[PDB]
Structures are given as C-alpha cells and as structure tokens.
Amino acid sequence: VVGGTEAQRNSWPSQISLQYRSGSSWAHTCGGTLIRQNWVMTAAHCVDRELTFRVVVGEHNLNQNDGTEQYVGVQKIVVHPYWNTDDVAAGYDIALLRLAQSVTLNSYVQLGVLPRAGTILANNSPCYITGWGLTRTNGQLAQTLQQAYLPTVDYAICSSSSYWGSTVKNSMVCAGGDGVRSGCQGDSGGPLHCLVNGQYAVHGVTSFVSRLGCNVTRKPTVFTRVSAYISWINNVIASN
Ligand SMILES: [Ca+2]
Numbered sequence: 299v300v301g302g303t304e305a306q307r308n309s310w311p312s313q314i315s316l317q318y319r320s321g322s323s324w325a326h327t328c329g330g331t332l333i334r335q336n337w338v339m340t341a342a343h344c345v346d347r348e349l350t351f352r353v354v355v356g357e358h359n360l361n362q363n364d365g366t367e368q369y370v371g372v373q374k375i376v377v378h379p380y381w382n383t384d385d386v387a388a389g390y391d392i393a394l395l396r397l398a399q400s401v402t403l404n405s406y407v408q409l410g411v412l413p414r415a416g417t418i419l420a421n422n423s424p425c426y427i428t429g430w431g432l433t434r435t436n437g438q439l440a441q442t443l444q445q446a447y448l449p450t451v452d453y454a455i456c457s458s459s460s461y462w463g464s465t466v467k468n469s470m471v472c473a474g475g476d477g478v479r480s481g482c483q484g485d486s487g488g489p490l491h492c493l494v495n496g497q498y499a500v501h502g503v504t505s506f507v508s509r510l511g512c513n514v515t516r517k518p519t520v521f522t523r524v525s526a527y528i529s530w531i532n533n534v535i536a537s538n
Contacts, residue, residue, distance in 0.1 A: 301479035302444035312410030329488020340487035425492035431485030435511035448474035475518030482512035
C-alpha cells in the first residue's frame with residue numbers, strides 16, 4: 299500500500315496474509331479475506347504458481363511475533379473457472395481457499411462481511427484498501443498492516459479513455475487514482491473495505507495496478523467486484 303498509515307491492530311480482522319514456502323521460511327505474497335472459519339477469498343492470480351501456501355490470520359507485523367497469529371495450511375484451491383492468467387483485464391480474478399483447519403475467531407480474527415449480490419457503489423464512495431504490499435512503486439513490503447483511504451471511481455469514469463479504458467470491466471471496482479495512495483505488489487488478493495449503511499463490507503479483491511507504477515494519477519487501483527460473485531462463492535463453498 300503506497301501512501302498508507304499503519305492500521306490499528308483490531309481494525310481489519312478478516313484480513314489475512316497468504317504466504318508460500320521458500321526453503322526453511324515462508325514469504326508473504328498476497329492478502330486475502332477470511333469469509334468462513336475455513337475459507338479464504340483471494341485473487342486467482344495469487345495462486346497461479348504451483349506453490350505451497352499457508353494463510354496467517356490474526357497477523358499484524360509480518361516480521362515479529364504479535365502473540366495473536368494462527369497459521370493454517372491451504373487444503374484446496376478453487377480458482378474462478380473463467381480466469382485466464384495472461385488476461386487479468388478480462389476479470390474473474392478471484393479464488394477461494396479451503397483451509398486445512400477451521401481457525402478460532404476472537405477480536406483479531408473475524409469473518410469479512412460481503413456485499414449483497416449486484417450492489418454497485420456510487421462514485422466516490424468511502425473505502426480503505428489494506429495490506430502488507432510495497433510501500434512505494436518498486437519498493438519493499440510493509441512490516442505492519444497498512445491502510446489507505448481510496449474513494450471508488452465509478453465504472454463510467456473508470457472505463458473512460460483518460461483512466462483505464464476498455465481494460466476495466468463492470469465486474470470490477472476501481473478506487474483511488476489520486477497519484478499518491480494505491481495498492482502495490484503484495485496487496486493483491488486482499489480486501490477493499492467500503493462503508494455502507496454504517497457497516498464496512500469487503501466490496502473488492504485487490505487485482506491490479508498500472509504497469510507504469512502503483513500510485514499513478516488516473517490509474518486507480520482495480521479490484522474484482524465481490525458483489526458480482528456472490529452466487530459463485532456460495533456455490534463453491536456449498537459443494538466443498
Ligand atoms: Ca507477526
């Protein structure tokens with residue numbers, strides 16, 4: 299997250315760190331949203347590599363023990379069947395992970411609430427992106443969970459030529475593009491939390507940024523629109 303501020307420890311309890319094993323260690327690679335005690339919602343592109351993944355819930359500082367983390371293997375990966383790795387612009391960048399065990403819920407570990415099916419945010423709706431991703435374009439991961447206020451940029455505005463053009467679909471949500479604050483590598487797969495009727499809901503799964511860089515004016519961060527996948531999600535979880 300470029301231009302963020304450190305999150306308070308109990309602000310975003312459904313945020314997870316998706317990590318892959320590298321030798322003796324584990325490396326953070328993406329965010330995710332805990333949606334059931336044994337299910338995590340992340341971006342399909344986070345799990346294209348044939349890696350060994352684990353999810354850490356209750357995580358705050360990647361580099362220190364917080365006394366609040368729980369670590370769980372990933373037991374099954376269900377990517378959206380229409381997902382095409384060389385075509386993130388086509389969308390369907392979403393995946394569900396069934397965890398090998400059900401995690402315990404407490405103040406640091408809660409399920410993320412999802413929007414009702416088809417809900418579209420009005421332009422400039424208030425949202426926060428969260429994650430441990432790069433803090434500067436071509437920078438480094440954050441140690442502590444970062445958050446950044448990113449107002450949505452509606453589809454009409456987002457798909458217009460000065461912004462993302464045909465690259466953005468109505469299956470996506472755009473937010474930010476102020477040239478200061480944005481998602482950045484390592485944030486993919488995590489939540490875009492937006493305030494609606496007084497409650498935060500995870501409206502977006504962080505998908506991509508401009509090849510030009512993370513915080514680029516008129517290239518707002520792009521997310522998979524969770525509200526277009528509600529049946530899919532329930533369908534997957536119901537059959538597994
Ligand atoms: Ca930690």
